[PDB]
Amino acid sequence: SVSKANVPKIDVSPLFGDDQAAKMRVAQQIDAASRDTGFFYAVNHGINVQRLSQKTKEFHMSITPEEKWDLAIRAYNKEHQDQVRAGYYLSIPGKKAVESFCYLNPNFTPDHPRIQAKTPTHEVNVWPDETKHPGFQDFAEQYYWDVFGLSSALLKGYALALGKEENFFARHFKPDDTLASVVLIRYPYLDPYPEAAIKTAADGTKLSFEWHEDVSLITVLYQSNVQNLQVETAAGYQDIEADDTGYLINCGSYMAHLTNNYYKAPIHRVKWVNAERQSLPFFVNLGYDSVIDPFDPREPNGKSDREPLSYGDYLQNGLVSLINKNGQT
Ligand SMILES: C=C(S)[C@H](NC(=O)CCC[C@H](N)C(=O)O)C(=O)O[C@@H](C(=O)O)[C@H](C)CO
Numbered sequence: 001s002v003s004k005a006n007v008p009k010i011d012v013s014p015l016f017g018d019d020q021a022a023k024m025r026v027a028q029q030i031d032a033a034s035r036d037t038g039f040f041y042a043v044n045h046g047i048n049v050q051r052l053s054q055k056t057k058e059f060h061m062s063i064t065p066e067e068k069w070d071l072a073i074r075a076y077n078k079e080h081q082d083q084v085r086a087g088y089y090l091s092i093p094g095k096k097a098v099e100s101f102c103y104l105n106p107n108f109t110p111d112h113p114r115i116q117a118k119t120p121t122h123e124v125n126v127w128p129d130e131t132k133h134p135g136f137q138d139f140a141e142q143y144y145w146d147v148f149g150l151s152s153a154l155l156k157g158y159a160l161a162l163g164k165e166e167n168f169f170a171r172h173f174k175p176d177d178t179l180a181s182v183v184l185i186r187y188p189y190l191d192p193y194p195e196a197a198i199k200t201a202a203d204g205t206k207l208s209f210e211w212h213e214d215v216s217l218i219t220v221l222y223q224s225n226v227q228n229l230q231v232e233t234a235a236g237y238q239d240i241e242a243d244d245t246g247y248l249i250n251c252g253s254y255m256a257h258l259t260n261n262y263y264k265a266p267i268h269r270v271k272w273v274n275a276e277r278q279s280l281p282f283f284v285n286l287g288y289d290s291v292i293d294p295f296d297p298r299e300p301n302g303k304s305d306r307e308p309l310s311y312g313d314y315l316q317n318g319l320v321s322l323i324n325k326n327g328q329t
């Protein structure tokens with residue numbers, strides 16, 4: 001069998017308050033988890049994940065093929081050249097099982113300075129018709145802000161963990177310009193399940209998505225209660241237990257860059273499971289021009305031989321590379 005990965009449950013509630021000592025004790029837990037498998041579950045996070053799941057299910061199960069084309073990103077619909085990131089990512093029956101809906105910062109409106117400039121990675125969200133999906137847009141926008149708030153708190157914990165002041169990351173994570181995204185992923189139950197939609201790892205494990213590091217600062221993930229994720233450790237790939245009451249947290253490769261691999265971006269993959277389930281990541285991205293000077297918390301002078309990299313540069317190049325490596329989702 002595959003061994004269970006160590007994924008501690010960390011009560012992150014102190015990170016919302018003003019008890020600095022208590023925050024330090026949470027930071028230590030984040031440090032330990034980040035230095036070990038690179039994953040932890042944030043518990044006592046304050047978000048109503050059951051309602052998120054319910055609203056997401058109502059959306060996935062009621063949206064029609066017509067609407068999917070009308071909301072599709074450019075990869076599926078040549079008419080929508082502005083939709084690189086935001087919109088619907090279609091399944092391909094008999095070939096590709098997964099489908100999803102991505103949205104960005106609700107503040108990226110037509111008048112936003114980065115939208116006017118047509119800066120890469122900024123787009124205006126697309127939404128289904130309100131009469132067909134009543135309350136969905138409002139719910140989804142509010143969810144963005146709810147998970148932004150959790151993520152800000154988590155970023156205070158990571159900053160303290162690394163020996164910095166608590167706003168070290170969060171000062172670059174701002175409502176007016178964050179490049180963060182929500183993805184509402186549907187993994188279907190299918191009978192029969194098309195072999196073409198199943199990948200096979202070198203070790204023989206059936207997969208829905210191959211090994212990768214995340215393109216993010218951190219990733220803040222809600223998943224249904226169906227085990228599927230695996231993390232590569234020195235002991236090999238290990239199973240990450242499901243917990244549909246908590247958020248699964250890990251670092252992306254921007255964190256690895258900034259910390260000179262002190263907090264690695266864990267390599268992980270998604271096992272194929274024939275189950276109707278949800279995977280709802282929030283990718284914690286900074287602003288387009290955000291640059292944090294790389295450092296090394298294992299070195300006495302804290303200096304690193306990595307060059308500063310703007311977040312916008314990192315993101316545009318990472319999203320493309322991901323598609324090249326593991327395919328268009
Ligand atoms: C490889 C990853 S981390 C997938 N992410 C992407 O494909 C990038 C989406 C970026 C988005 N379109 C944007 O524009 O921001 C992803 O979301 O995987 C989730 C899953 O497959 O369950 C789960 C997180 C498994 O790792």
Ligand SMILES: [Fe+2]
Pocket residue numbers: 212213214268
């Ligand atoms: Fe991932």
